[PDB]
């Protein structure tokens, strides 16, 4: 994971929709019904992919290790300053533009994702480049 040299301790909780979509290579994994996702799990996929792909030609990225999740205590009784930092991860909720390359050229990439996310943690879908995009 990576949410290094943060700045604060913790966030809060909500969820509902955002701004992920594009393309960025044509080997895409897009979420759909999630929320936050373990930076770890994340790396999981990272691995899954990386390894499948004859183990070399790079994939890309997508979301980030974003926030700090806290179960606070360890199992006590509740009233801590709610302190304790512990699990860091992504906050993606409306089918998000999760972008992963390599040069698989195929349903091979497919598999890669297949497992990566099948795994990961939600109802989600995948594809390629479908309606470009024009900027300034």
């Amino acid at each position: 994971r990576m949410k290094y040299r943060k700045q604060q301790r913790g966030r809060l909780k909500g969820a509902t929709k955002g701004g992920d979509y594009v393309a960025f290579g044509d080997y895409g994994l897009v979420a759909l019904e999630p929320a936050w996702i373990t930076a770890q799990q994340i790396e999981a996929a990272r691995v899954a992919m990386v390894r499948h792909f004859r183990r070399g030609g790079k994939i890309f990225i997508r979301i980030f290790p974003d926030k700090p999740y806290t179960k606070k205590p360890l199992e006590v009784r509740m009233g801590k300053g709610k302190g304790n930092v512990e699990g860091y991860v992504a906050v993606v909720k409306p089918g998000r533009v999760m972008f992963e390359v390599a040069g698989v050229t195929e349903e091979q990439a497919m598999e890669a994702l297949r497992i990566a996310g099948h795994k990961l943690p939600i109802k989600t879908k995948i594809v390629r480049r479908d309606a470009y995009d024009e900027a300034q």
Binding site: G25, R55, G56, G57, K58, G103, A131, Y132, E134
Partner: protein, 180 residues
């Protein structure tokens, strides 16, 4: 090639209903003369899809006034895909804003090379070219490795010239699998 069926009514209620039948809102626009014409998707799409259609305009039929146009904007649909409003501009004669389809061949020294593959960043060019841009503006080389990269500078510009883009900034570059 393209065409459509107009909206007398417009804005919300209407485009929604459109959707309902299988029609998405459409903006027909030409240098400060504007009209809301509406989108019959299915076909609409096949068309768009051509994509060659999105890069290099086409002709549309409305009422019976065959005219020249492209997409200058589009609201494609949040919760999935498909759209929320398709946007086209019909041209007079000075087309400067051109993201012409671009193709280039990084003839081997890439993946057959040190494993490294080539990353396509620009792939298209928003330069200038009035009512004159090909379905394929292109360029070529034979290196894709080391820590190699090339862009808008190297470029190599054809006929209806004019770089509305920038002094080079990455058409493409090559990265290693587990290095080279």
């Amino acid at each position: 090639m393209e065409y459509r069926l107009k909206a007398y009514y417009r804005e919300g209620e209407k485009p929604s209903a459109l959707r309902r039948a299988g029609k998405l809102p459409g903006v027909m626009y030409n240098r400060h003369l504007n009209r809301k014409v509406y989108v019959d998707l299915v076909e609409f799409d096949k068309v768009f899809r051509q994509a060659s259609i999105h890069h290099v305009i086409v002709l549309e039929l409305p009422d019976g006034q065959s005219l020249p146009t492209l997409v200058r904007q589009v609201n494609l649909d949040k919760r999935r895909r498909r759209p929320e409003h398709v946007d086209f501009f019909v041209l007079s004669d000075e087309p400067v804003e051109m993201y012409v389809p671009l193709r280039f061949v990084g003839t081997p020294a890439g993946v057959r090379a040190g494993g490294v593959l080539q990353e396509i960043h620009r792939d298209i060019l928003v330069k200038v070219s009035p009512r004159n841009i090909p379905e394929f503006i292109e360029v070529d080389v034979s290196g894709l490795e080391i820590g190699d990269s090339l862009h808008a500078s190297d470029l190599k510009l054809p006929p209806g010239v004019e770089l509305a883009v920038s002094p080079e900034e990455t058409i493409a570059a090559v990265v290693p699998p587990e290095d080279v």
